[PDB]
Design a binder for this molecule. Structure first.
Ligand code: HEM
Ligand code: HEM
Ligand code: HEM
Ligand code: HEM
Lengths: 145, 141, 141, 146
């Protein structure tokens, strides 16, 4: 978790002009569409058999709100990411048995949704800074293992 | 593997890309160099500075190759045998780099065509680039 | 993607396997359950104990599928589409489990056919299992 | 790493009846055959043109000796993999930019070479114990990413 002063100003300067709840909703929704096997882990979610269904699913939107809230903690405490994501690391790896490679997939979904929502403002430099973050958050949840 | 829906989705996207291809290849590479500085090693012999004529030229080469892959979707091994010898036999490119460029290409298309970049489109394009990557890192003849 | 030498080697291996198939498929599954306990999730409904007739029978079903895939190397999506619907549409198996099983299978062959398991054979077999894995995890109908 | 006492006696016993030098050499060789893109990381080794060439290569055989010595140190200090491999973690990542995914590929190559050498003695249980070691070793070299 580098984040220089220029990378700091880019991350929170651009994070402040998106709706974080919607970002988490769409990014999760897209993960379920693009990588369909992830649907299995979310069986508490009801029907997940189509693109129109899973994007309109309330349980999905509510959970993206949960997922982005945990992500938001990360930005505040980039100094101790491994300790911030302590409980969640245990949850995904022991109770849920989620393969670590799936973490970097959801991270990528977050990244492209920002781009989807921001367009030309999501510059190559701003991607790099957000890429450093999502990779850090991925290796903080996996890191048993 | 790509379904029937996957193919027509690919064809429509490269339809809607048209002449803008060269700009998106360029941008994808800039994003790959910036976000994954490891990939710069493979381009040690050209200028890789943000605004670079060499990167702009290479950007267009990539776009043409992707445009040709969208035409011959049902025969990706055949259409890209030359590019497969380049990347797999000669260049020896590590597969992760393709995942890096694929992703940076999807970010670009999301930034430029957010209306047409639906969840269902994104699934098709991710699958398309994955199979393009499989062929390119493969080694046959 | 598989070359001509890959094609020749896969045929030459499943000739040497023949009827010893189910025996190895059983051992592969048994290796997977032990080395990667995560995979036991997908088999909650059967007895998975080391000595188990249900695992023994499922091994024979897997071996015949690999034998069929070896026959139709040139058209893998065609021959296996019934299994692709099971694994991708119905079970939605995580693709990492396919790497786990592929590896456990390659360990098995190395224990029983170490004269035939040459580095060049290993390669041909690994690409095979990868492309068989790709079709099975992949959803195209 | 977990490792129970029976899981310990399984690892040190079977390791004792193989030649680590030969296991290291073949594992590296097989990695260079099966996953051809790794050949690029070893330019220092001269031509790696074919299966016949990369197996007879004395510089591959000698490097497999170096890889397996590091691996051997792991068995002695399973309490602290992160410290045992910290120096090599810096070399492979900061200096050579080897992607962590490669680390587990060589891990797999070691496991199959053992079964190749041990036959029916490389039991499922024995694989399970060695799988925990190689995954532990792999993630100890990647621990700088983090
Ligand atoms: C970007 C990394 C991720 C973050 C920040 C994250 C966050 C969270 C949080 C905060 C919860 C608990 C919600 C609560 O407090 O009630 C949760 C639960 C869960 N997560 Fe994740 N997650 C991530 C990655 C993933 C991925 C990729 C998967 C898909 C395999 C996944 C599967 C699950 C499941 C199945 C639950 C339980 C949901 C339930 O209560 O029914 N997580 N996640
Ligand atoms: C699917 C994505 C890719 C496509 C469509 C693609 C296509 C191409 C094309 C069309 C060329 C020029 C062919 C020629 O006339 O010589 C080329 C060359 C090259 N590619 Fe790629 N490639 C892809 C991925 C990659 C990746 C991920 C890397 C590694 C970072 C890479 C490294 C190179 C290098 C080093 C050259 C030679 C450049 C030169 O000196 O002219 N390629 N590729
Ligand atoms: C990699 C090559 C594989 C092949 C060739 C294969 C083949 C088969 C075959 C032939 C069947 C029985 C078809 C039937 O009559 O229902 C089956 C079922 C099944 N497979 Fe696989 N399989 C493979 C990998 C996997 C993996 C990695 C998993 C996950 C650990 C898995 C999980 C299952 C499950 C849960 C069933 C249904 C069992 C039942 O309810 O009877 N398979 N597969
Ligand atoms: C998986 C566990 C691994 C272990 C235990 C290991 C061990 C070692 C050791 C001890 C050295 C330094 C020897 C010396 O200083 O003379 C070394 C160097 C090196 N390793 Fe590995 N390594 C591992 C993984 C890998 C992999 C998968 C690759 C393939 C990309 C790799 C590529 C290299 C390279 C390029 C060097 C330097 C080459 C040279 O000395 O000219 N390492 N390794």
């Amino acid at each position: 978790v580098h984040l220089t002063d220029a990378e700091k100003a880019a991350v929170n300067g651009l994070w402040g002009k998106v709706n974080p709840d919607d970002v988490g909703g769409e990014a999760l929704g897209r993960l379920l569409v693009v990588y369909p096997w992830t649907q299995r882990y979310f069986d508490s979610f009801g029907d997940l058999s189509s693109a129109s269904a899973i994007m309109g699913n309330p349980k999905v939107k509510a959970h993206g709100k949960k997922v982005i809230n945990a992500f938001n903690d990360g930005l505040k405490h980039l100094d101790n990411l491994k300790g911030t994501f302590a409980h969640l690391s245990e949850l995904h790896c022991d109770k849920l048995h989620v393969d670590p490679e799936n973490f970097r997939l959801l991270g990528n979904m977050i990244v492209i949704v920002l781009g989807h929502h921001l367009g030309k403002e999501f510059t190559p430099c701003a991607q790099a800074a957000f890429q450093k973050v999502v990779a850090g958050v991925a290796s903080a949840l996996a890191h048993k293992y | 593997v790509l379904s029937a829906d996957d193919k027509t989705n690919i064809k429509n996207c490269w339809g809607k890309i048209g002449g803008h291809g060269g700009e998106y290849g360029e941008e994808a590479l800039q994003r790959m160099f910036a976000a994954f500085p490891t990939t710069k090693t493979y381009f040690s012999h050209i200028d890789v500075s943000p605004g670079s004529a060499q990167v702009k030229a290479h950007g267009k080469k990539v776009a043409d190759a992707l445009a040709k892959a969208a035409d011959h979707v049902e025969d990706l091994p055949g259409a890209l045998s030359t590019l497969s010898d380049l990347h797999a036999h000669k260049l020896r490119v590590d597969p992760v780099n393709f995942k890096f460029l694929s992703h940076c290409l999807l970010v670009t298309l999301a930034c430029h065509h957010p209306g047409d970049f639906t969840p269902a489109m994104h699934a098709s394009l991710d699958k398309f680039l994955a199979s393009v990557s499989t062929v390119l890192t493969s080694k046959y003849r």
